[PDB]
């Protein structure tokens, strides 16, 4: 009549957070790019033909990017798959033989590269081979008359060249969840990260995210909505990595106007080293043209998202990076297979107050990189034949602030930070892993039998 009992239901809308293993899915088509392991697509499940979305009526739910422990899972996953695209290719520790160098076969107009001859063990163990290559000033180092050099990993590490078959363009992947877990998605547009969301939504898997190797500029990513949302885990500690999400994208049409020669060298048997041959005649430099007009408008798209952080009438300043490595002072991103570190000196430079052309960004080039900060494991990128070009939508920024400077006069803002679990997290902000608890108790007036 009133003595309420316990009643058992199943399939309830209840959850708590818990970390466990997610897994991959990258279409039924990306498994057909060949090239021997483009990233990780191997036995991953193909992706469903139609992904739909559900908006949770009345749900007010907490979201974050910081202690969202998928920010650690994805970095550890992208780390060990890098070896799997490497271990059946060509290692090159004997390339620590000395090269006799000189400024290149040029008509001056300068060098930054050299014409370096050296001896090497070929297919036959007894036969030695004469061959010279061309390297950038970052791939080698002089050791302590003309100048002679060594490869740069030699005073620290071993090194392995990847297969030139393996291509390296960012290809999308969906992150997955099985029977018991899911991934949340707060469909707020004006979303400053912290708090319950008014119209919480959900997804079973994420959208398509590309693991773009980039510091400073985010590329091939995801846009913002309404106002260019400014995001950060912590805006007070100037040691933290701050991530901006653009709304209006910018065209980067990078170019390496040097028809490059790929000289394959036999030093195996079977294996091969890939040297740099002649560049045809004229001598030009790798840049990265950027629409001057698009930058100036997008500056206001975020600077007017800074007057909402200090003053309805105020002032904002910029200056180039405070210093450090190329990965924190220069926009690094993959272009062709070789790498481009682009000069951020000429961008962070203006001064804001109250009431058709293009600049270009100088870019250095690197082929041997010690990425992941693994002292012991450097690599060599087999050079790209021909002129290199890469169009992409500019998407975000990894940057820092200064300290107090003069308290509230204004503040200088520079690029830096770098860390690779926060380049990833620039595309992990709107998700959080949850464990689903399906059993639910209620008190209804019914009771069972004996």
């Amino acid at each position, epitope marked *: 009549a009133e003595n309420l009992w316990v009643t058992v239901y199943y399939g309830v809308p209840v959850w708590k957070d818990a970390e466990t293993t997610l897994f991959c899915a990258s279409d039924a088509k990306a498994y057909e790019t060949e090239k021997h392991n483009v990233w990780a697509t191997h036995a991953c499940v193909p992706t469903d033909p139609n992904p739909q979305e559900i908006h949770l009526e009345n749900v007010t739910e907490e979201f974050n990017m910081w202690k969202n422990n998928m920010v650690e899972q994805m970095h550890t996953d992208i780390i060990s798959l890098w070896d799997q695209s490497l271990k059946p290719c060509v290692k090159l520790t004997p390339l620590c033989v000395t090269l006799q160098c000189t400024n290149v076969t040029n008509n001056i107009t300068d060098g930054e590269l050299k014409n370096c001859s050296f001896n090497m063990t070929t297919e036959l163990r007894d036969k030695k081979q004469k061959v010279y290559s061309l390297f950038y000033r970052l791939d080698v180092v002089q050791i302590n008359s003309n100048k002679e050099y060594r490869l740069i990993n030699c005073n620290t590490s071993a090194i392995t060249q990847a297969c030139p078959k393996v291509s390296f363009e960012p290809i999308p992947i969906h992150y997955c969840a099985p029977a018991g877990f899911a991934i949340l998605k707060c469909k707020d547009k004006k979303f400053n990260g912290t708090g319950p969301c008014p119209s919480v939504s959900t997804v079973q898997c994420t959208h398509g995210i590309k693991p773009v190797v980039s510091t400073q500029l985010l590329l091939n990513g995801s846009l913002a909505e309404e106002e260019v949302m400014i995001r950060s885990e*912590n805006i007070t*500690n*100037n*040691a933290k990595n701050i991530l901006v999400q653009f709304n209006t994208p910018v065209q980067i049409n990078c170019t390496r106007p040097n028809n490059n020669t790929r000289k394959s060298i036999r030093i195996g048997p079977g294996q091969a080293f890939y040297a740099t041959g002649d560049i045809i005649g004229d001598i030009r430099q790798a840049h990265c043209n950027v629409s001057k007009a698009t930058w100036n408008e997008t500056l206001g798209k975020v600077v007017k998202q800074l007057r909402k952080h200090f003053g309805n009438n105020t002032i904002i300043r910029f200056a180039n990076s405070s210093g450090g490595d190329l*990965e*924190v002072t220069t926009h690094s991103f993959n272009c062709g297979g070789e790498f481009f570190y682009c000069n951020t000196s000429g961008l962070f430079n203006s001064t804001w107050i109250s009431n058709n052309d293009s600049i270009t960004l100088p870019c250095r080039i690197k082929q041997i990189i010690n990425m992941w900060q693994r002292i012991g494991q450097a690599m060599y990128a087999p050079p790209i034949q021909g002129v290199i070009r890469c169009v992409s939508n500019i998407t975000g920024l990894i940057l820092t602030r*200064d*300290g*107090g400077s003069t308290n509230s006069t204004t503040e200088t803002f520079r690029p830096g930070g770098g860390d690779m679990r926060d380049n990833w997290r620039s595309e992990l902000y709107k998700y959080k892993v949850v464990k689903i608890e399906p059993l639910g108790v209620a008190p209804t007036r019914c009771k069972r039998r004996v």
Partner: antibody
Amino acid sequence: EVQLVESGAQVKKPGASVTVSCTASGYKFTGYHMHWVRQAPGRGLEWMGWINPFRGAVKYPQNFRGRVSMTRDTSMEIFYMELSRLTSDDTAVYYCAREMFDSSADWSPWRGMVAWGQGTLVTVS
Amino acid sequence: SALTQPASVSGSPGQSITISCAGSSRDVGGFDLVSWYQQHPGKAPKLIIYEVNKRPSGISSRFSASKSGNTASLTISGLQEEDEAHYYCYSYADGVAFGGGTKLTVL
């Protein structure tokens, strides 16, 4: 054990610069923020700057921008540091110092001075 | 430095001491990020307390300090001749400012 090996006395002259070292030999380099700290003979100390050794994110107070240039060597594991526009007041010793909560994934802070070196004494006229 | 620390403090073995550390509406009174240190005369300096009052693993719990209102202060219980040293105050403020310093000695 760990250590912060510092250079011996490196006396230098005004209008120039000087190099002071903190060799690392026992702990993880990249993930551990490190500060340079200055101590004058019998006076108050000045916080100089710091670095994010993972690719070297350095910062200064506006006090010395244009003067100071500060960095490290990744695989040789050490901190160099220089301060330009020397004046005789700069006669002092120096100390490298680390922060508390450092790791791999989730960061913070900017505090908790634990580490100190050997006191590299330079002298300026 | 930006925190007024007094001139001197001296005593007899066994007593205890208090040292004030005052600023304005910005420094010690403005923020809860302080710390105090010890310098025995001529080696590597050492931290004793961080953040108002939380000891790090190892310091003998005769030392304890705090931050109240605007004047940070400290207290060392049962002075030994081991405690005869120089002492400071830290406080992250905008960047980092400091306390002037105060030495403890045996009378």
